[PDB]
């Protein structure tokens, strides 16, 4: 009860079952951005 609201928001959000989706999406964003850089490199080499 004397917990700050954010803790209960996290608790109910977990109760909804929406944690794994969140974690995997944020993890995937970094890797995809790195692929974006790679694609830039690819286009450079193609022009050469």
């Amino acid at each position: 009860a004397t917990a700050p609201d954010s803790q209960r928001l996290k608790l109910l959000r977990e109760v909804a079952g929406t944690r794994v989706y969140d974690e995997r999406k944020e993890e995937s964003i970094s890797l995809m951005k790195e692929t974006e850089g790679k694609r830039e490199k690819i286009n450079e080499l193609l022009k050469y």
Binding site: K38, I42, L45, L46, Y48
Partner: peptide, 21 residues
């Protein structure tokens, strides 16, 4: 990644030449 690797390999390939002088 595989495509990038293949492109880099290709670019290393094409740089050969044979000028017998």
């Amino acid at each position: 990644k595989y495509l990038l690797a293949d492109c880099n390999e290709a670019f290393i390939k094409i740089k050969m030449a044979f000028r017998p002088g």
